[PDB]
RNA sequence: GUAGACUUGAGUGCAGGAGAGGAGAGUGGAAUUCCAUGUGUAGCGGUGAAAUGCGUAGAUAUAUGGAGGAACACCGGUGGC
């Protein structure tokens, strides 16, 4: 007896960090009910950005998107990593309708100093 | 040294351009972090890994606007000043 929706063109916010990756599926502006990460699953160690583990991370919330009931995907990828690519082909092949893989990695212009030497 | 001469060195004229040359007076965007904020769940961190820790007071992440400082990637180069 809880409030539910049937959206179709969700917006798939997936952030591949350089250690992990969230895999999220979003509303029209939006907000995510069907969403996860790699690190949601207990792959904590050297297994934090294995790309087939990222494939299943880009599969689990992907199949959880049909709780809402969406099939076409409005993909948005941010950030690179060491597990990004099989996640990319994963949600390109995750029972979905890949048409628009967005690339929204934000760019400074000699901005703030990063933390130092190593 | 003394008187003398000329430009043929220097500089001053008339024409050109050039630059991150200085010093002030302002403006713009990206980006970071933070104020609320959609609405959802443990996450994120880091490495060879984690304890560090923060965080369920339920958030990061994602939707927005605001705030502020910093600095201004290709331009940019054995380039110039």
UniProtKB/Swiss-Prot annotation:
Pfam families, A to Z: Ribosomal_S11
Subunit: Part of the 30S ribosomal subunit. Interacts with proteins S7 and S18. Binds to IF-3.
Gene Ontology cellular component list: ribonucleoprotein complex; ribosome
Gene Ontology MF: a single term: rRNA binding
Keyword Lyase: no
Taxonomic lineage: Bacteria, Bacillati, Bacillota, Bacilli, Lactobacillales
Organism domain of life: Bacteria
UniProt xrefs under PANTHER family: 40S RIBOSOMAL PROTEIN S14/30S RIBOSOMAL PROTEIN S11
This protein's UniProt keywords: Ribonucleoprotein, Ribosomal protein, RNA-binding, rRNA-binding
Its job: Located on the platform of the 30S subunit, it bridges several disparate RNA helices of the 16S rRNA. Forms part of the Shine-Dalgarno cleft in the 70S ribosome.
Protein family: Belongs to the universal ribosomal protein uS11 family.
InterPro entries xref list: Ribosomal_uS11, Ribosomal_uS11_bac-type, Ribosomal_uS11_CS, Ribosomal_uS11_sf
The name this protein goes by in its record: Small ribosomal subunit protein uS11
Organism of origin: Lactococcus lactis subsp. cremoris (strain MG1363)
GO biological process: translation
């Amino acid at each position: 007896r809880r409030v539910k929706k049937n959206i179709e063109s969700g917006i798939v916010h997936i952030q591949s960090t350089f250690n992990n990756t969230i895999v999220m599926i979003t509303d029209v502006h939006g907000n995510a009910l069907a969403w996860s990460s790699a690190g949601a699953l207990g792959f904590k160690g050297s297994k934090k950005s294995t790309p087939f583990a990222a494939q299943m991370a880009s599969e689990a919330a992907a199949k959880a998107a049909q709780e809402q009931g969406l099939k076409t995907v409005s993909v948005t990828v941010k950030g690179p990593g060491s597990g990004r690519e099989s996640a990319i082909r994963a949600l390109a092949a995750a029972g979905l309708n890949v048409t628009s893989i967005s690339d929204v990695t934000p760019v400074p212009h000699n901005g703030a100093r990063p933390p130092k030497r190593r």
